[PDB]
């Protein structure tokens, strides 16, 4: 059944967060901001919303003016026909913080949002103070080397990477049924399932359960070829970079970031598989606070 | 019912085919047979049934006694807990044809059914007159080499190999919704969509639409590591082998069969992507008549 609105959710957090909207380049974005200090943009990924950062936002709000956004195609934000490449979505966020009167910001992103975080630093270095990448590197040529099958007992099948490439079938299969997808993902990541409760899962499922919302989600993934091409155009990132890697992705994240960025710092979230802000918020909040300063 | 019975479907075919059953080793298998002459076992794959051979069965029934089967886990056949490795499924079919009093049969299989067809020749050579593999080679180490992502225009996303590895999520997402799966597959293979009509698609969807049927289907794919292990133990087939390959699987199929078999013939289905019996039925019917003699 129904879940609380974004205003209800934002207000439920300590730190005085408010749910807001802003229109950038004709597209309306939802974000939740609060706290005081230098600006900190938080970007979530699939299939989640700004609410993915709930466990860390209050602590961060003590030091930063936190801006937690729904990406284009996500949650309360508009779901236009296109522009789901990370370069365009990063430009969205850039227009946003600039519209808010910020010349440069701290940026952290998770999952799809980490890609957007990287694209932001890549395309808008002057507006980028520091950037933190949570678990997920930007697409590059290595995306084409991902294997369909893992040998038994090794790693997790990244099935949704192939599946979300598809036209039509995803919304056809997943509409109304996104809670099952969320349950599968959490079942193959959380050390304790109670790390993300029923309500939290239902908030994501409700945001993604319509065919248009599923579809918008897939566009982030279908954009991968374009993202890969754009990535070839990026010079190395030279501002401070933070990579926070889960227990099984850490060394691959370190490799990619050290190759694509010149001032890289790494942190290992040893008790996490992927949903870092939810699996080890203590590590993410602490890492970001020490890193952004 | 939702669609015509297998009994109705069998009778609708010229050549006087009849739908039957038989129990082998506690597992009840459905098949449709007809015609006169030397026995010819026909094996379909995912997500199809014996009905996939409808366009060629009448032509073949004039020269061979055709036996078109639903595999274990498929269509009208039982769907037990296990035994979905291709070796076990081949033993099923061996027991079946021996129970019918045939010492040797010709064998042809497509898709998953082609793997079983190969396993049949491999494990029961004395019961194999000749064997034809339609498009799909038996699993080997190369399966761990399949790529999650294709460069644009470089081929189709083979997403279902990854997806069908999963526990629970496949039934949850696909039950009641297999028609959409079938449509996607046909949308990415048929040169003309009317090659497979609306009712035919619903016949397949109906066979697979319950959670148990989706699940049984995934077992064929989850057995892949075990199939790969079994393949390593096989000697070269020395009976006549025919490979019929689609325009894009041909050369891989030719490589594998020639390495695994000493008497190999190849045929190119130049206007087909994968569903050879439905896409180029005359080429298929014609090739089998020439090969089985
Ligand atoms: C872009 C994205 O594909 C999205 C997904 O959010 C993602 C990604 C990586 C994972 O390793 C990963 C996941 C994910 O949902 C997940 C669940 C369980 C285990 C696991 O390891 C993962 C990604 O970077
Ligand atoms: C075992 C199986 O995975 C099953 C599927 O039936 C299959 C297989 C190979 C394909 O290349 C292939 C398909 C398939 O449905 C399909 C549709 C569109 C393009 C295309 O190329 C394919 C297989 O071998
Ligand atoms: Na509010």
Min Cα–Cα distance to chain A from B67, Å: 34
Q: After which residues does chain A become discontinuous at a C–N distance over 2.5 Å?
A: none
A112-123 and A224-232 helices, crossing angle to 10°: 30
A95 CB-contact burial (10 Å; exposed 0-12 / middle 13-18 / buried 19+): middle
Q: Which of A108, A99, A105, A92 lies closest to A43, judged by CA? A: A108
Spacing, Cα B157 to ligand 2 middle (Å): 10
Nearest CB to A184: which of B143, B151, B168? B168
Residue pair A250/A266 in contact (Cβ under 8 Å)? The answer is yes
Decide: helix, strand or coil at residue B156: coil
Decide: helix, strand or coil at residue B9: helix
- Calpha distance B213→B171 (Å, rounded): 8
Closest residue by CA, ligand 1 atom 13: A274
Chain CA centroid to CA A69, Å: 9
Q: Is the CB of B116 under 6 A from ligand 2?
A: no
Decide: helix, strand or coil at residue B133: strand
Min Cα–Cα distance to chain B from A164, Å: 9
A112-121 CB burial, b ≥16 within 10 A, e <16: bbbbbbbbbb
In 10 A of CB A126, how many CB atoms? 7
Strand A64-69 versus strand A27-34 pairing type: antiparallel
Nearest CB to A177: which of B148, B166, B173? B173
* CB pair distance less than 8 Å for B181 and A169: yes
The DSSP annotation for B221-281 comes to: HHTHHHHHHHHHTPPPB-S-EEEEEETTTHHHHHHHHHHHBSSEEEEEETT-SS-HHHHSH
Please state, in angstroms and as integers, the Cα–Cα distance from residue B171 to each residue in B46, B78, B187, B293, following that order: 15, 17, 22, 42
Q: Which helix (H) or strand (E) holds B30?
A: strand B27-34
Q: B131: alpha, beta or left, given left = phi > 0 and alpha = psi -120 to 50?
A: beta
Q: Which helix (H) or strand (E) holds B66?
A: strand B64-69
State the sign of the Cα–Cα–Cα–Cα dihedral B270, B272, B274, B276.
negative
Contacts of B259 (CB under 8 A, 6+ apart): none
- Calpha distance A113→A90 (Å, rounded): 9
* CB pair distance less than 8 Å for A177 and B180: no
Closest residue by CA, ligand 1 atom 22: A274
- Calpha distance A11→A34 (Å, rounded): 10
Spacing, Cα A57 to ligand 3 middle (Å): 15
Structure token digits, residue B292: 């089985």
Q: In B80-127, where do the E strands start and end?
A: 105-110
Residue pair A135/A245 in contact (Cβ under 8 Å)? The answer is yes
Residue pair A183/B182 in contact (Cβ under 8 Å)? The answer is no
Residue pair B206/B8 in contact (Cβ under 8 Å)? The answer is no
Q: Give the technique used to solve this structure.
A: X-ray
* CB pair distance less than 8 Å for A172 and B180: yes
Residue pair A39/A97 in contact (Cβ under 8 Å)? The answer is yes
Q: B158, B195, B273: which to mutate for ligand 2, most atoms within 8 A of CB?
A: B158
- Calpha distance B292→B270 (Å, rounded): 21
Residue pair A221/A109 in contact (Cβ under 8 Å)? The answer is no
Q: A52, A146, A154, A158: which to mutate for ligand 1, most atoms within 8 A of CB?
A: A158
Decide: helix, strand or coil at residue B58: helix
3-class SS string, chain A = CCCCCHHHHHHCCCCCCEEEEEEECCEEEEEEEECCCEEEEEECCCCCCHHHHCCCHHHHHCCEEEEEECCCCCCCCCCCCCCCCHHHHHHHHHHHHHHCCCCCEEEEEECHHHHHHHHHHHHCHHHEEEEEEECCCCCCHHHHHCECCCCCCCCCCCHHHHHCCCCCHHHHHHCCCHHHHHHHHHHCCCCCHHHCCHHHHHHHHHHHCCHHHHHHHHHHHHCHHHHHHHHHCCCCECCCEEEEEECCCHHHHHHHHHHHECCEEEEEECCCCCCHHHHCHHHHHHHHHHHHC
């Amino acid at each position: 059944g129904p879940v609380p609105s974004d205003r209800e959710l934002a207000r439920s957090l300590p730190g005085g967060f408010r749910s807001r909207h802003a229109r950038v380049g004709g597209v309306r974005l939802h974000y939740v901001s609060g706290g005081h200090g230098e600006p900190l943009l938080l970007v979530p990924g699939w299939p989640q919303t700004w609410w993915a950062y709930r466990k860390v936002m209050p602590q961060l709000a003590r030091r930063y003016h936190v801006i937690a956004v729904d990406l284009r195609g996500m949650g309360g934000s508009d779901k236009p026909a296109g522009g789901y490449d990370k370069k365009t979505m990063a430009a969205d966020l850039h227009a946003l913080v600039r519209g808010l009167g910020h010349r440069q910001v701290n940026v952290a992103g998770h999952d799809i949002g980490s890609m957007v975080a990287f694209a932001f630093a890549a395309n808008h270095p002057e507006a980028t103070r520091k950037v933190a990448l949570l678990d997920t590197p930007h697409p590059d040529q290595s995306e084409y080397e991902m294997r369909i099958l893992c040998r038994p007992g090794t790693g997790t099948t990244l099935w949704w990477f192939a599946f979300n490439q598809l036209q039509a079938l995803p919304e056809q299969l997943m509409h109304g049924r996104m809670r099952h997808v969320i349950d599968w993902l959490y079942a193959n990541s959380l050390a304790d399932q109670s790390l993300v409760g029923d309500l939290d899962r239902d908030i994501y499922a409700n945001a993604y359960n319509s065919p248009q919302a599923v579809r918008a989600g897939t566009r982030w993934f279908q954009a991968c070829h374009q993202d890969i091409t754009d990535q070839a155009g990026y010079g190395k990132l030279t501002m401070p970079v933070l990579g926070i890697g889960g227990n099984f992705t850490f060394e691959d994240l370190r490799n990619k970031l050290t190759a694509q960025a010149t001032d890289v710092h790494m942190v290992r979230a040893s008790k996490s598989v992927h949903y870092l802000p939810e699996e080890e918020p203590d590590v993410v909040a602490g890492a970001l606070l020490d890193f952004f300063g």
